[PDB]
Amino acid sequence: EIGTGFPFDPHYVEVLGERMHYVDVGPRDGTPVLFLHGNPTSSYVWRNIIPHVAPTHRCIAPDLIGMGKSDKPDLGYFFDDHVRFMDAFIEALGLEEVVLVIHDWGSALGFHWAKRNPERVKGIAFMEFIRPIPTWDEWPEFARETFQAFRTTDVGRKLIIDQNVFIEGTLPCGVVRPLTEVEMDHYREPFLNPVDREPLWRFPNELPIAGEPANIVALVEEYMDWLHQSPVPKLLFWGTPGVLIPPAEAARLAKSLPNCKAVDIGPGLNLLQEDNPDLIGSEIARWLSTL
Ligand SMILES: [Cl-]
Protein backbone atom coordinates (compact mmCIF):
# COMPACT_ATOMS: atom_id res chain seq x y z
CA GLU A 1 0.00 0.00 0.00
CA ILE A 2 1.60 3.23 -1.20
CA GLY A 3 0.45 5.89 1.29
CA THR A 4 -1.99 8.48 0.02
CA GLY A 5 -1.84 10.80 3.04
CA PHE A 6 0.15 14.04 3.41
CA PRO A 7 0.88 14.19 7.15
CA PHE A 8 3.13 17.28 7.21
CA ASP A 9 2.39 20.48 9.14
CA PRO A 10 2.24 23.36 6.69
CA HIS A 11 5.05 25.97 6.88
CA TYR A 12 5.07 29.24 5.00
CA VAL A 13 7.75 31.82 4.25
CA GLU A 14 7.34 35.16 2.49
CA VAL A 15 9.32 35.31 -0.76
CA LEU A 16 9.28 38.24 -3.17
CA GLY A 17 5.92 39.41 -1.82
CA GLU A 18 4.34 35.95 -2.02
CA ARG A 19 3.76 33.15 0.43
CA MET A 20 5.59 29.92 -0.41
CA HIS A 21 4.49 26.71 1.36
CA TYR A 22 6.99 24.01 2.38
CA VAL A 23 7.38 20.74 4.29
CA ASP A 24 10.07 20.90 7.02
CA VAL A 25 10.72 17.74 9.05
CA GLY A 26 13.62 15.83 10.57
CA PRO A 27 16.37 17.05 12.96
CA ARG A 28 17.13 20.79 12.92
CA ASP A 29 20.89 20.24 12.74
CA GLY A 30 23.19 18.91 10.00
CA THR A 31 23.10 19.36 6.23
CA PRO A 32 19.53 19.86 5.01
CA VAL A 33 18.00 17.78 2.18
CA LEU A 34 16.00 19.93 -0.27
CA PHE A 35 13.32 18.25 -2.43
CA LEU A 36 12.19 20.02 -5.64
CA HIS A 37 9.07 18.81 -7.48
CA GLY A 38 8.14 19.55 -11.06
CA ASN A 39 5.10 19.77 -13.30
CA PRO A 40 2.26 19.19 -12.48
CA THR A 41 3.04 18.01 -8.95
CA SER A 42 3.89 19.49 -5.51
CA SER A 43 5.70 18.46 -2.33
CA TYR A 44 2.99 15.78 -2.26
CA VAL A 45 5.05 13.80 -4.80
CA TRP A 46 7.74 13.35 -2.08
CA ARG A 47 5.37 12.19 0.68
CA ASN A 48 6.53 8.57 0.65
CA ILE A 49 10.18 9.32 0.10
CA ILE A 50 10.79 11.88 2.83
CA PRO A 51 10.02 9.43 5.68
CA HIS A 52 13.05 7.32 4.67
CA VAL A 53 15.23 10.40 5.05
CA ALA A 54 13.63 12.31 7.97
CA PRO A 55 14.88 9.89 10.66
CA THR A 56 18.45 11.27 10.27
CA HIS A 57 18.19 14.41 8.10
CA ARG A 58 16.34 17.67 7.78
CA CYS A 59 13.88 17.47 4.86
CA ILE A 60 12.65 20.68 3.21
CA ALA A 61 10.16 20.30 0.36
CA PRO A 62 8.73 23.57 -1.04
CA ASP A 63 5.78 23.98 -3.37
CA LEU A 64 6.74 26.02 -6.47
CA ILE A 65 5.16 29.45 -6.70
CA GLY A 66 1.64 29.07 -8.19
CA MET A 67 1.60 25.42 -7.23
CA GLY A 68 0.72 23.23 -4.27
CA LYS A 69 -0.24 25.32 -1.27
CA SER A 70 1.99 28.27 -2.26
CA ASP A 71 0.44 31.62 -3.23
CA LYS A 72 -0.79 32.06 -6.77
CA PRO A 73 -0.02 35.60 -8.11
CA ASP A 74 -0.82 36.81 -11.61
CA LEU A 75 2.45 35.90 -13.35
CA GLY A 76 3.44 34.26 -16.63
CA TYR A 77 5.14 31.56 -14.55
CA PHE A 78 8.15 31.39 -16.83
CA PHE A 79 11.06 29.23 -15.74
CA ASP A 80 12.74 32.53 -14.89
CA ASP A 81 9.95 33.42 -12.43
CA HIS A 82 10.49 30.04 -10.76
CA VAL A 83 14.25 30.63 -10.63
CA ARG A 84 13.74 33.95 -8.85
CA PHE A 85 11.28 32.51 -6.32
CA MET A 86 13.37 29.41 -5.58
CA ASP A 87 16.59 31.45 -5.17
CA ALA A 88 14.78 33.66 -2.72
CA PHE A 89 13.17 30.68 -0.89
CA ILE A 90 16.58 29.13 -0.30
CA GLU A 91 18.08 32.36 1.08
CA ALA A 92 14.98 33.11 3.18
CA LEU A 93 15.44 29.79 4.95
CA GLY A 94 19.10 30.71 5.47
CA LEU A 95 20.35 27.49 3.85
CA GLU A 96 24.09 27.26 3.43
CA GLU A 97 25.23 23.85 2.21
CA VAL A 98 22.45 21.52 0.96
CA VAL A 99 21.82 18.17 -0.63
CA LEU A 100 19.39 18.34 -3.56
CA VAL A 101 16.78 15.73 -4.46
CA ILE A 102 15.19 16.94 -7.64
CA HIS A 103 12.78 15.91 -10.36
CA ASP A 104 11.38 17.11 -13.75
CA TRP A 105 11.21 20.96 -13.70
CA GLY A 106 12.38 20.79 -10.09
CA SER A 107 15.59 19.35 -11.53
CA ALA A 108 16.04 22.23 -13.95
CA LEU A 109 15.67 24.47 -10.88
CA GLY A 110 18.13 22.38 -8.88
CA PHE A 111 20.84 21.97 -11.51
CA HIS A 112 20.70 25.65 -12.49
CA TRP A 113 21.04 26.53 -8.82
CA ALA A 114 23.89 24.02 -8.33
CA LYS A 115 25.78 25.47 -11.29
CA ARG A 116 25.52 28.95 -9.76
CA ASN A 117 26.35 27.76 -6.23
CA PRO A 118 28.64 24.76 -6.65
CA GLU A 119 30.49 25.25 -3.36
CA ARG A 120 27.16 24.99 -1.50
CA VAL A 121 25.99 21.65 -3.00
CA LYS A 122 27.13 18.48 -1.23
CA GLY A 123 25.28 15.95 -3.39
CA ILE A 124 22.50 15.70 -5.96
CA ALA A 125 19.97 12.95 -6.27
CA PHE A 126 17.95 13.23 -9.45
CA MET A 127 15.47 11.38 -11.63
CA GLU A 128 13.51 11.99 -14.84
CA PHE A 129 15.15 15.36 -15.24
CA ILE A 130 15.26 18.11 -17.82
CA ARG A 131 17.96 17.83 -20.51
CA PRO A 132 17.84 19.21 -24.08
CA ILE A 133 15.65 17.06 -26.33
CA PRO A 134 17.29 17.26 -29.82
CA THR A 135 14.29 16.04 -31.79
CA TRP A 136 10.61 15.23 -31.38
CA ASP A 137 11.52 11.84 -32.92
CA GLU A 138 12.54 10.76 -29.46
CA TRP A 139 8.82 10.73 -28.43
CA PRO A 140 5.98 8.34 -29.50
CA GLU A 141 3.14 9.69 -31.63
CA PHE A 142 0.60 10.43 -28.87
CA ALA A 143 3.06 12.30 -26.65
CA ARG A 144 4.45 14.16 -29.62
CA GLU A 145 1.03 15.32 -30.85
CA THR A 146 -0.14 16.20 -27.36
CA PHE A 147 2.90 18.25 -26.35
CA GLN A 148 3.06 19.90 -29.74
CA ALA A 149 -0.60 20.84 -29.19
CA PHE A 150 0.32 22.12 -25.69
CA ARG A 151 2.87 24.52 -27.13
CA THR A 152 0.38 26.97 -28.58
CA THR A 153 -1.60 29.83 -27.09
CA ASP A 154 -4.79 28.56 -28.72
CA VAL A 155 -5.27 24.78 -28.55
CA GLY A 156 -2.62 24.39 -25.85
CA ARG A 157 -4.43 26.78 -23.54
CA LYS A 158 -7.79 25.17 -24.31
CA LEU A 159 -6.38 21.78 -23.40
CA ILE A 160 -4.45 22.78 -20.29
CA ILE A 161 -6.30 25.83 -18.95
CA ASP A 162 -9.94 25.12 -19.95
CA GLN A 163 -10.01 21.33 -20.02
CA ASN A 164 -7.31 20.68 -17.33
CA VAL A 165 -5.77 17.94 -19.49
CA PHE A 166 -2.34 18.15 -17.86
CA ILE A 167 -3.85 17.08 -14.50
CA GLU A 168 -6.58 14.72 -15.69
CA GLY A 169 -4.78 13.20 -18.69
CA THR A 170 -0.98 13.67 -18.72
CA LEU A 171 -0.34 13.27 -15.04
CA PRO A 172 -1.69 9.69 -14.69
CA CYS A 173 0.07 8.83 -17.99
CA GLY A 174 3.33 9.50 -16.22
CA VAL A 175 2.84 6.71 -13.65
CA VAL A 176 2.98 2.95 -14.33
CA ARG A 177 0.66 1.93 -11.49
CA PRO A 178 -2.89 3.38 -11.43
CA LEU A 179 -3.15 6.47 -9.19
CA THR A 180 -6.17 6.43 -6.88
CA GLU A 181 -8.79 9.16 -6.94
CA VAL A 182 -7.59 10.27 -3.43
CA GLU A 183 -4.11 10.84 -4.87
CA MET A 184 -5.57 12.54 -7.87
CA ASP A 185 -7.50 14.82 -5.48
CA HIS A 186 -4.25 15.81 -3.80
CA TYR A 187 -2.75 16.66 -7.25
CA ARG A 188 -6.00 18.45 -8.33
CA GLU A 189 -6.43 20.63 -5.25
CA PRO A 190 -4.16 23.51 -6.34
CA PHE A 191 -5.82 23.93 -9.73
CA LEU A 192 -9.53 23.77 -8.99
CA ASN A 193 -9.80 27.34 -10.32
CA PRO A 194 -8.95 27.36 -14.06
CA VAL A 195 -7.22 30.74 -13.99
CA ASP A 196 -4.75 29.08 -11.55
CA ARG A 197 -3.68 26.51 -14.20
CA GLU A 198 -1.29 29.01 -15.91
CA PRO A 199 1.93 27.29 -14.62
CA LEU A 200 0.71 23.92 -16.00
CA TRP A 201 0.67 25.49 -19.47
CA ARG A 202 3.77 27.68 -19.35
CA PHE A 203 5.98 24.72 -18.18
CA PRO A 204 5.50 22.55 -21.31
CA ASN A 205 6.01 25.69 -23.41
CA GLU A 206 9.39 26.02 -21.69
CA LEU A 207 10.54 22.44 -22.38
CA PRO A 208 13.82 22.49 -24.42
CA ILE A 209 12.73 20.43 -27.44
CA ALA A 210 14.31 20.62 -30.91
CA GLY A 211 16.05 23.86 -30.01
CA GLU A 212 13.08 25.84 -28.65
CA PRO A 213 12.81 28.05 -26.70
CA ALA A 214 16.43 28.86 -27.49
CA ASN A 215 17.06 30.54 -24.12
CA ILE A 216 15.88 27.50 -22.13
CA VAL A 217 17.95 25.18 -24.34
CA ALA A 218 21.04 27.35 -23.68
CA LEU A 219 20.45 27.48 -19.90
CA VAL A 220 19.99 23.71 -19.75
CA GLU A 221 23.08 23.03 -21.94
CA GLU A 222 24.96 25.18 -19.45
CA TYR A 223 24.01 23.33 -16.33
CA MET A 224 24.48 19.94 -18.10
CA ASP A 225 28.04 20.96 -19.09
CA TRP A 226 28.66 21.91 -15.47
CA LEU A 227 27.18 18.60 -14.28
CA HIS A 228 29.63 16.70 -16.57
CA GLN A 229 32.58 18.47 -15.06
CA SER A 230 31.71 18.72 -11.32
CA PRO A 231 32.78 15.94 -8.94
CA VAL A 232 29.70 16.52 -6.73
CA PRO A 233 28.29 13.16 -5.55
CA LYS A 234 25.44 12.12 -7.83
CA LEU A 235 22.66 9.61 -7.47
CA LEU A 236 20.55 8.89 -10.54
CA PHE A 237 17.27 6.98 -10.30
CA TRP A 238 15.87 5.57 -13.56
CA GLY A 239 13.06 3.24 -14.61
CA THR A 240 11.74 1.32 -17.65
CA PRO A 241 10.58 2.57 -20.12
CA GLY A 242 11.08 6.02 -18.54
CA VAL A 243 10.01 9.27 -20.21
CA LEU A 244 12.55 12.12 -20.07
CA ILE A 245 15.29 9.61 -19.35
CA PRO A 246 15.09 6.29 -21.23
CA PRO A 247 17.31 3.37 -20.04
CA ALA A 248 20.01 4.08 -22.68
CA GLU A 249 20.29 7.72 -21.59
CA ALA A 250 20.46 6.69 -17.93
CA ALA A 251 23.29 4.27 -18.81
CA ARG A 252 25.16 7.02 -20.65
CA LEU A 253 24.81 9.42 -17.76
CA ALA A 254 25.66 6.76 -15.20
CA LYS A 255 29.09 6.30 -16.75
CA SER A 256 29.81 9.82 -18.10
CA LEU A 257 28.86 11.97 -15.07
CA PRO A 258 31.64 12.07 -12.44
CA ASN A 259 30.91 10.29 -9.12
CA CYS A 260 27.52 9.04 -10.15
CA LYS A 261 25.73 6.05 -8.70
CA ALA A 262 22.79 4.80 -10.79
CA VAL A 263 19.79 2.92 -9.34
CA ASP A 264 17.29 0.98 -11.43
CA ILE A 265 13.89 1.32 -9.78
CA GLY A 266 12.21 -1.17 -12.08
CA PRO A 267 9.05 -0.16 -13.98
CA GLY A 268 8.62 3.62 -14.28
CA LEU A 269 7.62 6.50 -16.53
CA ASN A 270 8.02 10.10 -15.25
CA LEU A 271 6.85 10.17 -11.62
CA LEU A 272 9.27 7.51 -10.36
CA GLN A 273 8.32 8.45 -6.81
CA GLU A 274 4.86 7.01 -7.37
CA ASP A 275 6.10 3.65 -8.65
CA ASN A 276 8.98 2.83 -6.25
CA PRO A 277 9.06 5.25 -3.28
CA ASP A 278 10.53 2.60 -0.93
CA LEU A 279 13.64 1.95 -3.01
CA ILE A 280 14.10 5.64 -3.85
CA GLY A 281 13.82 6.77 -0.20
CA SER A 282 15.85 3.79 1.09
CA GLU A 283 18.64 4.44 -1.43
CA ILE A 284 18.67 8.17 -0.75
CA ALA A 285 19.13 7.52 3.00
CA ARG A 286 21.87 4.97 2.24
CA TRP A 287 23.67 7.31 -0.19
CA LEU A 288 23.44 10.19 2.31
CA SER A 289 25.24 8.06 4.91
CA THR A 290 28.25 7.95 2.51
CA LEU A 291 28.50 11.71 1.92
CL1 LIG B 1 6.15 20.26 -18.48
Curated annotation (Swiss-Prot):
EC number: 3.8.1.5
All copies of domain AB hydrolase-1, residue ranges: 32-156
Active site feature: D104, E128, N270
GO annotations of cellular component type: membrane
Bilayer-spanning residue ranges: none
Pathway given in the UniProt record: Xenobiotic degradation; haloalkane degradation
Bridged cysteine pairs (disulfide): none
Keywords: Detoxification, Hydrolase
Pfam family, one: Abhydrolase_1
One GO-annotated biological process of the protein: response to toxic substance
Enzyme class: hydrolase
N-terminal signal peptide: none
GO MF entry, a single one: haloalkane dehalogenase activity
InterPro entries, A to Z: AB_hydrolase_1 (IPR000073), AB_hydrolase_fold (IPR029058), AB_hydrolase_sf (IPR050266), Epox_hydrolase-like (IPR000639), Haloalkane_dehalogenase_2 (IPR023594)
Keyword rRNA-binding applies: no
Catalytic activity: 1-haloalkane + H2O = a halide anion + a primary alcohol + H(+)
Keyword Nucleus: no
PANTHER family for this protein: CIS-3-ALKYL-4-ALKYLOXETAN-2-ONE DECARBOXYLASE, MONOACYLGLYCEROL LIPASE
Quaternary structure and interacting proteins, as annotated: Monomer.
Family to which the UniProt record says this protein belongs: Belongs to the haloalkane dehalogenase family. Type 2 subfamily.
Biological role stated in the UniProt entry: Catalyzes hydrolytic cleavage of carbon-halogen bonds in halogenated aliphatic compounds, leading to the formation of the corresponding primary alcohols, halide ions and protons.
HAMAP family (alphabetical): Haloalk_dehal_type2
Name of the protein this chain belongs to: Haloalkane dehalogenase
Natural source organism: Rhodococcus sp
Taxonomic classification: Bacteria, Bacillati, Actinomycetota, Actinomycetes, Mycobacteriales
